[PDB]
Design an enzyme around this catalytic site. Structure first.
Site, short mmCIF file in Angstrom:
data_model
loop_
_atom_site.label_atom_id
_atom_site.label_comp_id
_atom_site.label_asym_id
_atom_site.label_seq_id
_atom_site.Cartn_x
_atom_site.Cartn_y
_atom_site.Cartn_z
N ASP A 41 -13.37 -25.84 38.00
CA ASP A 41 -13.57 -25.03 39.20
C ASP A 41 -14.20 -23.70 38.80
O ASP A 41 -13.67 -23.00 37.94
CB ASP A 41 -12.22 -24.80 39.89
N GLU A 101 -19.12 -8.73 12.62
CA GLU A 101 -18.38 -9.84 12.04
C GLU A 101 -19.31 -11.04 12.17
O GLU A 101 -18.88 -12.19 12.09
CB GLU A 101 -17.05 -10.09 12.77
N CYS A 126 -13.07 -7.48 15.62
CA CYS A 126 -13.58 -6.66 16.72
C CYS A 126 -13.17 -5.19 16.64
O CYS A 126 -13.42 -4.43 17.57
CB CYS A 126 -13.10 -7.23 18.05
N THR A 185 -16.02 -17.45 26.90
CA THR A 185 -15.91 -16.03 26.59
C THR A 185 -17.03 -15.50 25.70
O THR A 185 -17.03 -14.33 25.33
CB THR A 185 -14.56 -15.71 25.90
N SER A 215 -3.51 -15.64 20.23
CA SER A 215 -4.43 -14.51 20.29
C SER A 215 -4.06 -13.50 21.37
O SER A 215 -4.25 -12.30 21.19
CB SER A 215 -5.87 -15.00 20.51
N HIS A 218 -10.52 -2.97 24.45
CA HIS A 218 -11.44 -3.94 23.87
C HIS A 218 -11.53 -5.04 24.93
O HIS A 218 -10.52 -5.41 25.53
CB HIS A 218 -10.86 -4.52 22.58
N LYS A 249 -4.01 -8.41 31.64
CA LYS A 249 -2.66 -8.75 31.23
C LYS A 249 -2.12 -7.68 30.28
O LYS A 249 -0.96 -7.29 30.38
CB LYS A 249 -2.63 -10.12 30.54
N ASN A 304 -17.98 -11.39 25.65
CA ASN A 304 -17.44 -10.72 24.47
C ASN A 304 -18.56 -10.44 23.46
O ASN A 304 -19.33 -11.33 23.11
CB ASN A 304 -16.38 -11.63 23.83
N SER A 338 -8.79 -8.96 15.59
CA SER A 338 -7.89 -10.05 15.23
C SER A 338 -7.56 -9.98 13.75
O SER A 338 -8.34 -9.45 12.96
CB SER A 338 -8.53 -11.40 15.55
C1 LIG Z 1 -9.13 -17.30 26.75
C2 LIG Z 1 -8.74 -18.76 26.57
C3 LIG Z 1 -7.35 -18.85 25.95
C4 LIG Z 1 -8.73 -19.44 27.91
O1 LIG Z 1 -8.56 -20.85 27.74
P1 LIG Z 1 -8.83 -21.86 28.94
O2 LIG Z 1 -8.04 -23.09 28.68
O3 LIG Z 1 -10.29 -22.14 28.99
O4 LIG Z 1 -8.42 -21.15 30.35
P2 LIG Z 1 -6.80 -21.02 30.49
O5 LIG Z 1 -6.28 -22.40 30.71
O6 LIG Z 1 -6.17 -20.37 29.32
O7 LIG Z 1 -6.48 -20.15 31.79
C5 LIG Z 1 -7.54 -19.72 32.64
C6 LIG Z 1 -6.98 -18.91 33.78
O8 LIG Z 1 -7.62 -19.33 35.02
C7 LIG Z 1 -6.63 -19.69 35.96
N1 LIG Z 1 -7.17 -20.77 36.79
C8 LIG Z 1 -7.14 -22.12 36.56
N2 LIG Z 1 -7.84 -22.81 37.44
C9 LIG Z 1 -8.24 -21.86 38.37
C10 LIG Z 1 -8.97 -21.96 39.56
N3 LIG Z 1 -9.45 -23.11 40.05
N4 LIG Z 1 -9.20 -20.82 40.25
C11 LIG Z 1 -8.67 -19.68 39.79
N5 LIG Z 1 -7.99 -19.46 38.67
C12 LIG Z 1 -7.81 -20.60 37.99
C13 LIG Z 1 -5.41 -20.08 35.13
O9 LIG Z 1 -4.23 -20.01 35.89
C14 LIG Z 1 -5.48 -19.04 34.02
O10 LIG Z 1 -4.94 -17.80 34.45
P3 LIG Z 1 -3.74 -17.12 33.64
O11 LIG Z 1 -2.94 -18.20 33.01
O12 LIG Z 1 -4.30 -16.17 32.64
O13 LIG Z 1 -2.88 -16.35 34.73
C15 LIG Z 1 -9.76 -19.45 25.65
O14 LIG Z 1 -11.04 -19.53 26.29
C16 LIG Z 1 -9.93 -18.74 24.31
O15 LIG Z 1 -9.39 -19.18 23.29
N6 LIG Z 1 -10.69 -17.65 24.31
C17 LIG Z 1 -11.35 -17.11 23.12
C18 LIG Z 1 -10.39 -16.33 22.24
C19 LIG Z 1 -10.03 -14.97 22.82
O16 LIG Z 1 -10.75 -14.44 23.66
N7 LIG Z 1 -8.92 -14.41 22.37
C20 LIG Z 1 -8.04 -13.56 23.17
C21 LIG Z 1 -8.19 -12.09 22.83
S1 LIG Z 1 -7.87 -11.72 21.08
C22 LIG Z 1 -9.28 -10.61 20.91
O17 LIG Z 1 -9.71 -9.84 21.77
C23 LIG Z 1 -9.83 -10.81 19.52
C24 LIG Z 1 -11.19 -11.50 19.52
C25 LIG Z 1 -11.14 -12.74 20.41
O18 LIG Z 1 -12.18 -10.60 20.04
C26 LIG Z 1 -11.58 -11.91 18.10
C27 LIG Z 1 -11.87 -10.73 17.19
O19 LIG Z 1 -11.14 -9.72 17.25
O20 LIG Z 1 -12.85 -10.81 16.42
#
Ligand SMILES: CC(C)(COP(=O)([O-])OP(=O)([O-])OC[C@H]1O[C@@H](n2cnc3c(N)ncnc32)[C@H](O)[C@@H]1OP(=O)([O-])[O-])[C@@H](O)C(=O)NCCC(=O)NCCSC(=O)C[C@@](C)(O)CC(=O)[O-]
Ligand SMILES: CC(C)(COP(=O)([O-])OP(=O)([O-])OC[C@H]1O[C@@H](n2cnc3c(N)ncnc32)[C@H](O)[C@@H]1OP(=O)([O-])[O-])[C@@H](O)C(=O)NCCC(=O)NCCSC(=O)C[C@@](C)(O)CC(=O)[O-]
Lengths: 389, 389
Positions: A28, A78, A110, A151, A200, A232, A241, A274, A306
């Site tokens: 969706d 990075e 980051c 992302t 994460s 960030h 959050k 990102n 991270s």
């Molecule tokens: C970010 C995830 C975990 C998401 O993973 P995902 O499985 O693609 O999405 P999800 O299942 O985790 O949840 C998506 C959200 O959409 C909602 N949802 C569901 N369906 C619908 C709908 N129909 N309409 C509206 N809303 C809907 C659902 O409820 C949920 O909301 P939440 O649970 O947060 O309340 C994944 O993509 C990921 O691993 N991301 C990349 C890693 C990342 O960003 N890390 C987190 C931050 S750590 C950081 O900043 C360090 C980093 C990442 O930059 C690395 C570095 O420092 O170098």
């Protein structure tokens, strides 16, 4: 005072609509638009690497005078293209900066751009007539059909640090927090990062809370003392959050203000994605241009990397800063991009993996006024320079 | 005063005799012993990576009190094992340093440890009760039968920067010089560096001359003002050629002194090889322990990094510094090593390329009192800690 005198960013000329990506990934659209909080994803053409993106972010904010006064060029990334040669060296050359300068890279996920500007400030203490150029440049690539794909993004942010900064004065109150965790990392040889999705988010929020708590204790301050916070941004859903995790003790007046400040801070990020080391600073640009903060007010910043390392520090708006931002240029940069289909995005993605040059697909002819990777001969990257040069 | 309060190094427990290596490569032993100026080459067992070597270099100079005062841990390396996570994070964890500290890597070939200690000093200017830990750690690997093979080495150097340093006060006279050149580099994906042997010579010397000339001009100084010079050591002969290129305008008393000082400075390096970021600082340790310099005397230091960036700065000896070195421990470290045949060395080398563990060949049982890489599970490196913990 010492701080950010000039700031700018650069993102590639292509993007993919998140609603379109959702449709292609059988989900969706609101999952991406609202769930994750992203609208448009930056797509990288092969002719834009971290070096050219960094040079493009800095070129518009460095004068001939600045070139003579810059004593250090630090690149935070990075997404390095060499294990030995610092990208700062090529950028220093492309920008024509005076030779008697230090050039090197800083690395820690980051987080890297933060110690870069903070130590740049420390360096400048005894050098009132010098400046330092800090460049965050990265390509957040997780892989097609990967969990982190939504992302993704790419771009660079350049900052000129100096005395009598025209935009933000950096205060002496920074506090960092390190904790050895494997939430996200990329061992040598891996094209894409390894990530523990759920972990994460926990690591990110903990780092923020621990850094903030120590800062509040050391400075005897509270959230009520800030006009806004700037974090960030891996994706807006993340920062929200994290934000709510603490404002949860703040009075209603403060909560309303900080929540509003956040929306202004992640406005631009929603259309880019990102960009790792540059995410927090792209958000800073978004905040400074989208909000009407007053001179003398203080911003609270949290930088995360991270692995992990977090840092909370504050900065104060300088009288007249609005006249030193380039909001029109920035709005133009984002609007002038061209949308590409998911199929086209996947083709671009695969070509980027192996640096497969194609002057027609990358529409190189359109890039006459910017720096770009033109070819690689004998393992040496060659760059096209702005035609006005 | 702010500077080097403590300094130490670590090298692996194995080495190959350069005369033996010469025989295996079908060349006169003197080509290596005198021509290049190396006697023994450090050999890396798989259980020693940059993290464990760095921790081993720092462990003997970090007290429980230091752990509470260290505000930053900076790792300089061009041999990273992760493209995102800074090795400084793991070392910070292994050493048990207090949590509120910045941890990150700096990269620019063999130059990186220099801006690390210089910026550490700038950071401490307003933090009287803090210290900074800088660690240079690298594995100079060119490849079997390669042009650079004879100059290989591995090791790490740790330095604690603080106020009222017990050994060397860092003066405010540093000047760097950057020039884009492809003498040595290592594109992502390349196990070994690409090198232009002849060019690297000229690049190294030009960087030295340009840096020294500007330093002399800015400070109104001459070589006669230095008790000794200390340079980066990829191999002893290199530093000798660079040395002779300028002393070529110095009086006879100065030439004799600086030549003698150089021999003392490269003594330890002859038995280790090039350790990239740590070479200059291993030479500093060698100079401090092998020569009998007097308090108040000044040392001139030149740091180089291919790509390229050079920097010349000075440091002054602190009264009583001899009581803060560890010459006995260092002679023991070098002497306690075991010689390996060329065939064994090639076996170790190939195993290191793929991180192929072998507890018997690496003889891990002998390493009970040090840090070492014990295994890798799910892409996460595990480390053995000194049993005295
Ligand atoms: C970010 C995830 C975990 C998401 O993973 P995902 O499985 O693609 O999405 P999800 O299942 O985790 O949840 C998506 C959200 O959409 C909602 N949802 C569901 N369906 C619908 C709908 N129909 N309409 C509206 N809303 C809907 C659902 O409820 C949920 O909301 P939440 O649970 O947060 O309340 C994944 O993509 C990921 O691993 N991301 C990349 C890693 C990342 O960003 N890390 C987190 C931050 S750590 C950081 O900043 C360090 C980093 C990442 O930059 C690395 C570095 O420092 O170098
Ligand atoms: C160092 C080279 C070029 C040597 O290359 P090579 O072919 O192995 O040896 P050579 O032919 O260059 O000459 C060896 C010397 O031995 C002599 N010789 C000949 N036969 C005999 C004999 N029987 N008895 C005695 N002497 C003998 C011969 O005359 C010569 O003396 P020189 O020409 O200097 O007067 C090569 O191994 C190489 O590419 N080295 C690696 C790169 C390097 O170390 N670069 C130099 C400094 S650049 C630097 O410091 C940056 C760096 C390297 O650290 C990278 C970074 O920053 O990360």
């Amino acid at each position: 005072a010492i701080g950010i005198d000039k700031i700018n960013f650069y993102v590639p000329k292509y993007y993919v609509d998140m609603a379109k990506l959702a449709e292609a990934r059988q989900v969706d659209p609101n999952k991406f638009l609202i769930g994750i909080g992203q609208t448009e994803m930056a797509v990288s053409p092969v002719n834009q690497d971290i070096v050219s993106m960094g040079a493009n972010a800095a070129k518009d904010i460095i004068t001939d005078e600045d070139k003579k006064k810059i004593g250090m060029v630090i690149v935070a990334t990075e997404s390095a293209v060499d294990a030995a040669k610092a990208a700062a060296v090529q950028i220093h050359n492309l920008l024509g900066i005076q030779p008697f300068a230090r050039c090197f890279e800083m690395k820690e996920a980051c987080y890297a751009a933060t110690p870069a500007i903070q130590l740049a400030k420390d360096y400048l203490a005894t050098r009132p007539n010098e400046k330092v150029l800090v460049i965050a440049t990265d390509t957040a690539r997780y892989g097609l059909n990967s969990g982190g794909e939504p992302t993704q993004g790419a771009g660079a942010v350049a900052m000129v640090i100096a005395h009598n900064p025209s935009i933000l004065a950096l205060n002496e109150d920074a506090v960092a927090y390190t904790e050895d965790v494997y939430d996200f990392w990329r061992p040598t040889g891996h094209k894409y990062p390894l990530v523990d999705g759920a972990l994460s988010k926990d690591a990110y929020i903990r780092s923020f809370q621990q850094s903030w708590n120590e800062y509040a204790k050391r400075q005897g301050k509270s959230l009520a003392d800030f006009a806004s916070l700037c974090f960030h941004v891996p994706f807006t859903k993340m920062g929200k959050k994290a934000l709510e995790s603490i404002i949860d003790n703040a009075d209603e007046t403060t909560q309303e203000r900080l929540r509003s400040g956040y929306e202004d801070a992640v406005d631009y990020n929603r259309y880019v994605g990102n960009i790792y080391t540059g995410s927090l600073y792209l958000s800073l640009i978004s905040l400074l241009e989208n909000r009407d903060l007053q001179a003398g007010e203080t911003i609270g910043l949290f930088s995360y990397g991270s692995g992990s390392v977090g840092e909370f520090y504050s900065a104060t708006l300088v009288e007249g800063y609005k006249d030193h931002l380039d909001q029109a240029a920035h709005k133009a940069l984002l609007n002038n991009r061209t949308e590409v289909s998911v199929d086209a995005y996947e083709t671009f993605f695969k070509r980027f993996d192996d640096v497969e040059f194609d002057e027609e697909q990358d529409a190189v002819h359109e890039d006459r006024h910017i720096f770009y990777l033109s070819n690689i001969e004998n393992n040496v990257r060659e760059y096209h320079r702005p035609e006005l040069e």
